[PDB]
Design a protein around this ligand. Structure first.
Ligand SMILES: [Cu+2]
Ligand SMILES: [Cu+2]
Ligand SMILES: [Cu+2]
Length: 305
């Protein structure tokens, strides 16, 4: 989308709502596959709710975009190569826009809580320029409101930390599992993330030994937030389990979890909503509490998609 210029990034939408445009400050990538980041402090200190996102992407060059909420962006600059990092503190993903997989809207009545005393103070935008003098102001327009939402969006991130993929190894599974101990959450979307060695990624809710699919996807396909086939509640006592299937074929050395292309990642982002009075905005699982449970994981978790 065009650079904003004189009107600025804040557009009043009504007395209690406004649109905040988070855009690259006229950048001009010089290499293929460049990742740029920029941040914006929220204009209001009090709590607000993010209830909608509208992509403003230059269809030709922009491969994908991600928007995070955090309190300490990696750089205080105008923009930077994200290899410097997205946030120093924990970055809370709010939205993903991938070129060949249009995003799905948030369910009405659902909003992410930001600002205030405990919410994110900054938005951090990451734009991935794939195919490239002209300045690009691609980004996202966020719809914010002061009106408390009845349902609060949050994120349950399942991620491996210890995976080691031996060179040439045929199959390597990275399993993650935690017991859920909060009020109930309803999963409505999910996103998988792996680098080049990932074949398939699947997440499940396990209740009384029974496995319910949350999402299963080939991480090589656009890493968008895809809608869940059917809303899945997860309640106190349930166990969340995820498995990423990797291969070492093609590598001459071992691959471990890390930030570079030569490293791997096994991440499953589970986006959910919770009743406002019970809601917590984020949870993470980097452990594998029920290792043997995977002896009963659906076969689909190992068959590519
Ligand atoms: Cu991309
Ligand atoms: Cu339900
Ligand atoms: Cu990664």
């Amino acid at each position: 989308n065009e650079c904003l210029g004189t009107i600025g990034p804040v557009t009043p939408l009504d007395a209690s709502d406004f649109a905040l445009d988070i855009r690259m400050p006229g950048v001009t990538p010089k290499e293929s596959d460049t990742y740029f980041c920029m941040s914006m402090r929220l204009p209001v200190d009090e709590e607000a709710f993010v209830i909608d996102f509208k992509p403003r992407a230059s269809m030709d060059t922009v491969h994908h975009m991600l928007l995070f909420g955090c309190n300490m962006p990696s750089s205080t600059g105008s923009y930077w190569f994200c290899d410097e990092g997205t946030c120093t503190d924990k970055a809370n993903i709010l939205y993903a826009w991938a070129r060949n997989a249009p995003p799905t809207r948030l369910p009405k009545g659902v909003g992410f809580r930001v600002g205030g005393e405990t919410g994110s103070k900054y938005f951090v935008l990451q734009v991935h320029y794939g195919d490239i003098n002209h300045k690009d102001c691609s980004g996202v327009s966020v719809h914010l409101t002061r009106v408390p939402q009845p349902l609060i969006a949050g994120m349950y991130l399942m991620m491996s930390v210890d995976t080691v993929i031996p060179p040439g190894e045929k199959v390597v599974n990275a399993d993650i599992s935690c017991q859920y101990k909060m009020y109930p959450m309803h999963v409505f979307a999910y996103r998988v993330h792996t680098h080049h060695l990932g074949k398939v990624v699947s997440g499940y809710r396990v209740r009384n030994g029974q496995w319910t699919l949350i999402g299963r996807q080939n991480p090589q396909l656009p890493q968008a937030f895809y809608p869940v086939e059917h809303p899945v509640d997860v309640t106190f006592g349930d166990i969340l389990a995820a498995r990423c299937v990797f291969t070492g074929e093609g590598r001459t050395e071992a691959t471990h979890i890390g930030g570079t292309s030569s490293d791997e990642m096994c991440n499953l982002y589970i986006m959910y909503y919770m009743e406002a009075k019970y809601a917590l905005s984020f949870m993470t699982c980097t452990k594998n509490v029920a290792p043997d449970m995977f002896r009963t994981i659906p076969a689909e978790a190992n068959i590519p998609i």
